[PDB]
Symmetry: C4
Subunit: 94 residues, 4 copies
């Protein structure tokens, strides 16, 4: 639980590393924009201020979403259950 | 349940207060636009009519999403289960 | 189950009726655009091809999302479980 | 489980085939853009770089979302549980 959250954290980090490199290189975004876009994509926000322009970028984004969404939201949840909720409940009492 | 919903309500309010101040100040949005954007972000709608323009805004938005999504949707759900569904079911019968 | 799906269906319909009237009137959208926008909003797609321009539209959209998201996705799910999955499984065998 | 994932995979594929043909034809998108848009829609990302322009496209998109969202996310999850998580856990040990 405290130990499992560390697994999803690495996996998420690795997923975002992959998107940051792909979109910097193929779509030509600055690395910070590429990471931002990767996060905005896999959390399903999708502002569209960055969006792939090339057919290679679109095909990767299809695959990137299907693979990553399940992971990322897995991490958000465990962060919610096993890391966020404790601190909350511990602040309720002295 | 009636008591827990009040916890998530405050926490959500505090999360949206934080986004409203950050985006008003760093991204220069009117306070109402900043709150609207914060809500549109953390519910994962993401119209993109407002989107951060500065690197500081993008880095904060990455962190803001990961922290807040789990909270907000937690509140939507409890609102659904413990506050919305009762009124519905009570209207079914006299 | 077959009976409960009918409840969420009406409630969803009523939620979308409300958005269709509000956005037609306050934001000035054609009624079909207003319904489309209401659906695109409460399912959290959020293309942003329509987005509220007035402060009244933004305040309503904040409230509309928090109230409706929980409902709508409730209906999508029951449609998935109690109406979509049966037909699927019945087609598996003669 | 290994067998059920194959069911959702076909159904998802068929759902995306339908969107690819509809949006190519009615909205006039290149087939690759149409598939990309279908995926970006049903995963609720919604960049809005493509969005339907015709009333027929908007009405279909309303129905397409309500029908498909439940399916697609069903597939993402099973992919997460029954296909993604194993490989993860098997890499943990030799
Ligand atoms: K946009
Ligand atoms: K735009
Ligand atoms: Tl945008
Ligand atoms: Tl941009
Ligand atoms: Tl979304
Ligand atoms: Tl979006
Ligand atoms: Tl937009
Ligand atoms: Tl704006
Ligand atoms: Tl958008
Ligand atoms: Tl747009
Ligand atoms: Tl428009
Ligand atoms: Tl979205
Ligand atoms: Tl866009
Ligand atoms: Tl386009």
């Amino acid at each position: 639980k405290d130990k499992e959250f560390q697994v999803l954290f690495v996996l998420t980090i690795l997923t975002l590393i992959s998107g940051t490199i792909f979109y910097s290189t193929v779509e030509g975004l600055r690395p910070i924009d590429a990471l931002y876009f990767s996060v905005v994509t896999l959390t399903t926000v999708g502002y569209g201020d960055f969006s792939p322009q090339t057919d290679f970028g679109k095909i990767f984004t299809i695959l990137y979403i299907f693979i990553g969404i399940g992971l990322v939201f897995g991490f958000i949840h465990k962060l919610a259950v096993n890391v966020q909720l404790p601190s909350i409940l511990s602040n309720l009492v002295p």
